[PDB]
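Support request from a user on the community tier.

User writes: "When I paste my structure tokens into the form, the page sometimes reloads and wipes my input. The last time it worked, I copied everything first. Here is what I submitted, just in case something in the input itself triggers the reload:"
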């Protein structure tokens, strides 16, 4: 079977209906992406376009990264939140306060390594926070 490695360095959270940015039957409270740098994992490219631009309207600098996307994320200054699928990778990431994921890829439930690779992003120097959606998963 698949055995994902643990990770006490990151705090696991359950995304709920609380906030202003709606996201898959869930409401991301800006307190999870606003206030610093955060990475949001999406399963659709069309959502990355609205979800990122919408954040700029909320007051957060958000970027959407995916296959065929231009370098726009800026993790060097200004609270920027990166919302991308598996295109941003993690060659230069790690400086994130938390990662909001939908635990689902292309509509299907994320795979064992998906959260393993997705969780490994926040917690580089401090305790990273990770909020997942999980419609019928636990």
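"...and here is what came back when it finally went through:"
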């Amino acid at each position: 079977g698949s055995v994902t490695v643990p990770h006490p360095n990151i705090e696991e959270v359950a995304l709920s209906t609380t906030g202003e940015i709606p996201f898959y039957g869930k409401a991301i409270p800006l307190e999870v992406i606003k206030g610093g740098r955060h990475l949001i994992f999406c399963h659709s490219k069309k959502k990355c376009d609205e979800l990122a631009a919408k954040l700029v309207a909320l007051g957060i600098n958000a970027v959407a990264y995916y296959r065929g996307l231009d370098v726009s994320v800026i993790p060097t200054n200004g609270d920027v939140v990166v919302v991308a699928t598996d295109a941003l990778m993690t060659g230069f990431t790690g400086d994130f306060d938390s990662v909001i994921d939908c635990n689902t890829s292309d509509g299907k439930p994320q795979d064992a390594v998906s959260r393993t690779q997705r969780r490994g992003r926040t917690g580089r120097g401090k305790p990273g926070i990770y909020r997942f959606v999980a419609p019928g998963e636990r």
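Agent notes: The reload is a front-end session timeout and is unrelated to the input. The radius of gyration is 14 Å. Strands lie at 10-14, 21-22, 27-28, 38-41, 61-65, 80-84, 98-101, 104-105, 108-109, 128-132. Escalated to web team.
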